[PDB]
Design an enzyme around this catalytic site. Structure first.
Site, PDB file in Angstrom:
ATOM      1  N   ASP A  60       1.283  -0.945  -0.191  1.00 34.15           N
ATOM      2  CA  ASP A  60      -0.030  -0.198   0.097  1.00 34.15           C
ATOM      3  C   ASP A  60       1.238   1.070  -0.177  1.00 34.15           C
ATOM      4  OD1 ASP A  60      -2.462   2.025   1.512  1.00 34.15           O
ATOM      5  OD2 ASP A  60      -3.854   0.318   0.462  1.00 34.15           O
ATOM      6  N   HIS A 101      -3.335   5.114   4.756  1.00 37.03           N
ATOM      7  CA  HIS A 101      -3.837   3.992   4.788  1.00 37.03           C
ATOM      8  C   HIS A 101      -3.224   2.598   5.097  1.00 37.03           C
ATOM      9  CE1 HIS A 101      -6.058   0.893   2.139  1.00 37.03           C
ATOM     10  NE2 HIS A 101      -7.478   1.852   2.728  1.00 37.03           N
ATOM     11  N   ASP A 120      -2.819  11.701   3.501  1.00 39.00           N
ATOM     12  CA  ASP A 120      -3.159  11.190   2.653  1.00 39.00           C
ATOM     13  C   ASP A 120      -2.497   9.202   2.437  1.00 39.00           C
ATOM     14  OD1 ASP A 120      -1.930  14.069   1.620  1.00 39.00           O
ATOM     15  OD2 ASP A 120      -3.983  13.038   0.499  1.00 39.00           O
ATOM     16  N   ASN A 121      -1.136   9.449   3.576  1.00 34.57           N
ATOM     17  CA  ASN A 121      -0.869   8.262   3.416  1.00 34.57           C
ATOM     18  C   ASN A 121      -0.493   7.451   4.451  1.00 34.57           C
ATOM     19  OD1 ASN A 121       0.637   8.293   0.604  1.00 34.57           O
ATOM     20  ND2 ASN A 121       1.458  10.367   1.458  1.00 34.57           N
ATOM     21  N   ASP A 142      13.126   0.700   4.066  1.00 37.97           N
ATOM     22  CA  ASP A 142      12.090   1.361   5.227  1.00 37.97           C
ATOM     23  C   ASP A 142      11.178   2.361   3.987  1.00 37.97           C
ATOM     24  OD1 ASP A 142      11.104   3.245   6.890  1.00 37.97           O
ATOM     25  OD2 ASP A 142      12.865   4.758   7.459  1.00 37.97           O
ATOM     26  N   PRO A 150      -7.336  -1.250 -10.480  1.00 36.73           N
ATOM     27  CA  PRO A 150      -7.940  -0.603 -12.020  1.00 36.73           C
ATOM     28  C   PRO A 150      -9.033   0.521 -11.369  1.00 36.73           C
ATOM     29  CG  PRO A 150      -8.379  -2.654 -12.372  1.00 36.73           C
ATOM     30  CD  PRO A 150      -7.656  -3.157 -11.423  1.00 36.73           C
ATOM     31  N   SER A 204     -10.854  -2.180   1.305  1.00 37.28           N
ATOM     32  CA  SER A 204     -10.085  -2.165   1.834  1.00 37.28           C
ATOM     33  C   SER A 204      -9.458  -2.445   3.141  1.00 37.28           C
ATOM     34  CB  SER A 204      -8.863  -1.199   0.765  1.00 37.28           C
ATOM     35  OG  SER A 204      -9.918   0.229   2.136  1.00 37.28           O
ATOM     36  N   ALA A 249      -8.944  -7.398  -1.920  1.00 36.48           N
ATOM     37  CA  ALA A 249     -10.225  -6.353  -1.636  1.00 36.48           C
ATOM     38  C   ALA A 249     -10.931  -6.609  -3.272  1.00 36.48           C
ATOM     39  CB  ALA A 249      -9.974  -5.287  -1.299  1.00 36.48           C
ATOM     40  N   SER A 250     -11.700  -6.602  -3.125  1.00 38.41           N
ATOM     41  CA  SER A 250     -13.055  -6.968  -5.012  1.00 38.41           C
ATOM     42  C   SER A 250     -12.740  -5.621  -5.013  1.00 38.41           C
ATOM     43  CB  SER A 250     -13.922  -7.233  -4.888  1.00 38.41           C
ATOM     44  OG  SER A 250     -15.057  -6.891  -3.387  1.00 38.41           O
TER      45      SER A 250
END
Ligand SMILES: C/C(=N\NC(N)=[NH2+])c1cc(N)cc(/C(C)=N/NC(N)=[NH2+])c1
Ligand SMILES: *[C@@H]1O[C@H](CO)[C@@H](O)[C@H](O)[C@H]1NC(C)=O
Ligand SMILES: [Ca+2]
Ligand SMILES: [Ca+2]
Ligand SMILES: [Ca+2]
Ligand SMILES: [Cl-]
Ligand code: NA
Ligand code: NA
Ligand code: NA
Ligand code: NA
EC number: 3.4.21.75
Length: 472
Positions: free
Chosen positions: A44, A85, A82-83, A72, A147, A259, A183-184
């Protein structure tokens, strides 16, 4: 065993619940399975490796920074955060337990790493180097990218990433195969149909969808036949969400979307692998099919397949059940080697027009070493032209009568490019005998005078010829 004392564990309703609307994880913990010895990596936007609820389980050997090409994976800090997740996903798997901080991971004694690979230009090579990171050390990979979920894209792994999948399941993990949990998608609002996503549509990924706290299909969910199972995630504003580690050494109660479902599944799979370290990548998918639970998941498309299992395009075989997974894993007999039976169906191109039906009776490689009497995945690999792709709906019916939706109508998909040997995949005929009549249905769901031609239909069957259970 004593249940975790962490301050937010009571808010982790999908674990600590006492009302049968949870993932049955305490039962696995009580059997002695917490993830000891298992290594999971989050592919991720990075991982806050010094987070107070991750540091104790952090594994540099499960981690890398592909975006900046260094070891790292620390996230890039911005005022929008933003980062965050990958840190949220990591805590779902393996947040430390009984340490007075936030909540716990599903596999709270597993080791956890992260690959920083979304924070930059995500090329085929970037994806391949992430999927193929340290494959004899990392057991389980978790990913929710792919996508665009705009409901008009058809795309999947390019060559390097596809090669990474085949190398992972073939030689990864000592030859048992990397377990790629996926994740679908999150394209529900755009009426997206997730077999158009080649990452989740792959047989090599163990694909997971979401359910809301009250047992409903969330607004963001995509239905498709390639999904295998479900874990809880977010829903409406009266329903609780996912509670986990957050960027800047914080704790969030508002992690959301499909997610958030894939990491919970990765954690359950980690507990299962602790219960039997010899499970192959295919064994793990078999365990999910056999143990997942439809009960109290609401959908209008629950259908019983040929071996008596209920399946839905929103939920696959249902909610993961950690206690049942670890119980069944312990004495599991390794499945036989995977066979592949290739059946080229058409003798001539077929006009689609308003509606096309193709019926073919197959013997599933009778008399050959790839004879299959016990299906795993099946694909209809289709090549077709059409003037407006999203007006098409495609179904595949197995000899046992199981109707798999290969493609639902996608109102935003105006493409005139058709499908170029696209391998639509279904899990819904798992363990069926594939001998007999298969039926492919292609229909124009609109009133428009649409037109096109089906030029190739390859039915690809995977599976074995031994070891069936009595039908459910
Ligand atoms: C489009 C997509 N997923 N689509 C799918 N699963 N079908 C997706 C999902 C998540 N969680 C992150 C990103 C990001 C931050 N991508 N960032 C980049 N490409 N630079 C893309
Ligand atoms: C793992 O499974 C294979 C195939 O059934 C078997 O040959 C091998 O002995 C097993 N290894 C362990 C450690 O159980
Ligand atoms: Ca770095
Ligand atoms: Ca904790
Ligand atoms: Ca999608
Ligand atoms: Cl293959
Ligand atoms: Na791409
Ligand atoms: Na691609
Ligand atoms: Na998949
Ligand atoms: Na049926």
């Amino acid at each position: 065993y004593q249940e975790p004392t962490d301050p937010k564990f009571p808010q982790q309703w999908y674990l600590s619940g006492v009302t049968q609307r949870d993932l049955n994880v305490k039962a696995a913990w009580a059997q002695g399975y917490t993830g000891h010895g298992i290594v999971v990596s989050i592919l991720d936007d990075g991982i806050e490796k010094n987070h107070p609820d991750l540091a104790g389980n952090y594994d540099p050997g499960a981690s890398f920074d592909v975006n900046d090409q260094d070891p790292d994976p620390q996230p890039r800090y911005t005022q929008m955060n933003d980062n965050r997740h990958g840190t949220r996903c990591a805590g779902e798997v393996a947040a430390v337990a009984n340490n007075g901080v936030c909540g716990v991971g599903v596999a709270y004694n597993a080791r956890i790493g992260g690959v920083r690979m979304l924070d930059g230009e995500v090329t085929d090579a970037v994806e391949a180097r992430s999927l193929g990171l340290n494959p004899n050390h990392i057991h389980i990979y978790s990913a929710s990218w792919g996508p665009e979920d705009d409901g008009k894209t058809v795309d999947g792994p390019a060559r390097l990433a596809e090669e990474a999948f085949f190398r992972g399941v073939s030689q990864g993990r000592g030859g048992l195969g990397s377990i790629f949990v996926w994740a679908s998608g999150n394209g529900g609002r755009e009426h997206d149909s997730c077999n158009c996503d080649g990452y989740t549509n792959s047989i090599y990924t163990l694909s997971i969808s979401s359910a809301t706290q009250f047992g409903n299909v969330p607004w963001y969910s995509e239905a498709c036949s390639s999904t295998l199972a479900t874990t809880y995630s977010s829903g409406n504003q009266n329903e609780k969400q996912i509670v986990t580690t957050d960027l800047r050494q914080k704790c969030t109660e508002s992690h959301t979307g499909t997610s958030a479902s894939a990491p919970l599944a990765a954690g359950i799979i980690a507990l299962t692998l602790e219960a039997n370290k010899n499970l192959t990548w295919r064994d793990m998918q078999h365990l999910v099919v056999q143990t997942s639970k439809p009960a109290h998941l609401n959908a209008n498309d629950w259908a019983t397949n040929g071996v008596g299992r209920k399946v839905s395009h929103s939920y696959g075989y249902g909610l993961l059940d950690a206690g049942a997974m670890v119980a069944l894993a312990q004495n599991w007999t390794t499945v036989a080697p995977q066979r592949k039976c290739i059946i080229d169906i058409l003798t001539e191109p077929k006009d689609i027009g308003k509606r096309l039906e193709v019926r073919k009776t197959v013997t599933a490689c009778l008399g050959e070493p790839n004879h299959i009497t016990r299906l795993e995945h099946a694909q209809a690999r289709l090549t077709l032209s059409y003037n407006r792709r999203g007006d098409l709906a495609i179904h595949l019916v197995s000899p046992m009568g199981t109707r798999s939706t290969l493609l639902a109508a996608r109102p935003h998909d105006y493409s005139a490019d058709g499908f170029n040997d696209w391998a639509f995949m279904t899990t819904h005929s798992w363990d069926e005998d594939p001998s007999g009549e298969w039926v492919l249905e292609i229909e124009n769901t609109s009133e428009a005078n649409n037109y096109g031609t089906l030029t190739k239909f390859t039915l690809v069957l995977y599976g074995t010829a031994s070891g069936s259970l009595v039908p459910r």
